[PDB]
Write a protein that binds this ligand. Sequence first.
Ligand code: HEC
Length: 89
Amino acid sequence: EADLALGKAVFDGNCAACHAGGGNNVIPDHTLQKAAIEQFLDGGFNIEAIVYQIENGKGAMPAWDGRLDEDEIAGVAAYVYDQAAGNKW
Ligand code: HEC
């Protein structure tokens, strides 16, 4: 599901610290656009993957399974996925 209203509100405080504007801090190449996600998200460019990765915490990335609820797990994923797909980053 998701509503961008909520999803971005989380992003701003939670994700942006690394991925501000579809960026990174730790790995300045792994963004959140499709050219990154397609290869660097184990599972490839899918919402279900992003859901099932955001919670699990791939590599040098905090696991969100206990921070981000069945709501914002959907919320922020949907947000970044839209940006990614659209080129709206
Ligand atoms: C810095 C402490 C991070 C925070 C905060 C978040 N992410 Fe991240 N993410 C980070 C890194 C270094 C990586 C790559 C790890 C590796 O093994 O090299 C990622 C990866 C992602 C991906 C997959 C695509 C990619 O860039 O490799 C996605 C879809 C992603 N991250 C989403 C995401 C969201 C929505 C966050 C807030 C809930 C978030 N990340 C925080 C580092 C960091």
